[PDB]
Amino acid sequence: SANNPWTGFQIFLSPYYANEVAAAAKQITDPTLSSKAASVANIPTFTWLDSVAKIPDLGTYLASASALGKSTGTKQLVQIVIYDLPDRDCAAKASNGEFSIANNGQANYENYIDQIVAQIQQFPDVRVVAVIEPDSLANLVTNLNVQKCANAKTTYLASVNYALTNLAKVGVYMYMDAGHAGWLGWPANLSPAAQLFTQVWQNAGKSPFIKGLATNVANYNALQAASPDPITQGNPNYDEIHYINALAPLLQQAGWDATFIVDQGRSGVQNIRQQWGDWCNIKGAGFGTRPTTNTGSQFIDSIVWVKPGGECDGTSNSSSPRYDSTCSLPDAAQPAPEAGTWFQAYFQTLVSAANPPL
Numbered sequence: 001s002a003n004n005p006w007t008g009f010q011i012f013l014s015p016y017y018a019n020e021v022a023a024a025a026k027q028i029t030d031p032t033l034s035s036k037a038a039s040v041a042n043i044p045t046f047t048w049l050d051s052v053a054k055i056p057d058l059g060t061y062l063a064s065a066s067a068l069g070k071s072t073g074t075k076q077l078v079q080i081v082i083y084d085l086p087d088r089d090c091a092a093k094a095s096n097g098e099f100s101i102a103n104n105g106q107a108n109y110e111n112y113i114d115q116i117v118a119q120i121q122q123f124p125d126v127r128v129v130a131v132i133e134p135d136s137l138a139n140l141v142t143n144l145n146v147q148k149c150a151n152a153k154t155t156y157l158a159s160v161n162y163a164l165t166n167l168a169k170v171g172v173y174m175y176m177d178a179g180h181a182g183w184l185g186w187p188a189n190l191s192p193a194a195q196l197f198t199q200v201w202q203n204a205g206k207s208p209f210i211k212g213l214a215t216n217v218a219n220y221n222a223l224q225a226a227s228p229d230p231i232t233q234g235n236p237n238y239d240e241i242h243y244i245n246a247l248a249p250l251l252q253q254a255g256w257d258a259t260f261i262v263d264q265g266r267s268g269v270q271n272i273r274q275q276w277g278d279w280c281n282i283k284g285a286g287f288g289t290r291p292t293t294n295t296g297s298q299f300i301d302s303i304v305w306v307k308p309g310g311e312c313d314g315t316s317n318s319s320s321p322r323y324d325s326t327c328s329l330p331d332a333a334q335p336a337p338e339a340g341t342w343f344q345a346y347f348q349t350l351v352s353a354a355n356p357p358l
Helices: 014-026 031-042 053-072 106-120 147-168 189-205 240-253 344-352
Strands: 048-049 076-082 127-134 173-177 210-215 259-263 300-302
Touching: 014 053, 014 344, 031 300, 031 344, 048 053, 053 076, 053 106, 106 147, 147 173, 147 189, 147 300, 147 344, 173 240, 210 240, 240 259
Parallel strands: 048 076, 076 127, 127 173, 173 210, 210 259, 259 300
Antiparallel strands: none
């Protein structure tokens, strides 16, 4: 499109991920690898607003970015993930979301959005890009047979709508999560997905700030695969570029010339999964293509690092109340700590296996 949110801006580098990386690099014993690990702190990532407790961090990042831009003559851009739906991750065996539909989820989520908007409103000289609710709308395409998802459908739609509608009022550039090629990229899922995303875009007023869709968030697919990963058998859309090339025209026909961003933060190593759906701490993952607007596709505004590699996807401990058995599969690195906490051994391999090399 004409307006790529990133062009002409300096991305704000998460100091938190930076602090996680710095603490991680000092523990890596090979000197060459330690220095490569430390440099990961210079690679832009998304900040996950996975709870209300993270909202003051957003405020600090906006204010810090504003000052850094004035100190360097740059216009700054802060990258966030909106990730706090009631009954979050409805098809998972476990979720870490603090809100539940049964306990005023809709009002509580609205208040979470209101608090985020109230921060963003105070810093109009900083640009914000938001990924909207990973692991949400995609479930409403393929997983309505999951009763928790069927029962969450109206809440997911209403809450995502509230986020889009109100973040647009403060000029946030938004990409709704749209799964990945092995989820919504199956040819038969493309039209149901397009119908859902376009209804969501319509309900939120077709705001020009709703730029399009984010794919491969927290996943491991190639953007452009040299050859299909065996997990993809049966799906001609075996990588993200095939998925995006197929989905984009369906959105265009609806009047939404949507563009895309693609997570590649853990995509450096292909052919590491037993089954395509295995998502938790996949063993042997490497850091992938660094964020760039040089994407190779008319439809793609940026390659991004949405999930911050090194932060765990979930515990392998079956005694945890947050345990999802996906995190104990033969292709999941174990033992693994609780979701979001630092997984040092996993980070060190992400560095060692980075492709392109760091």
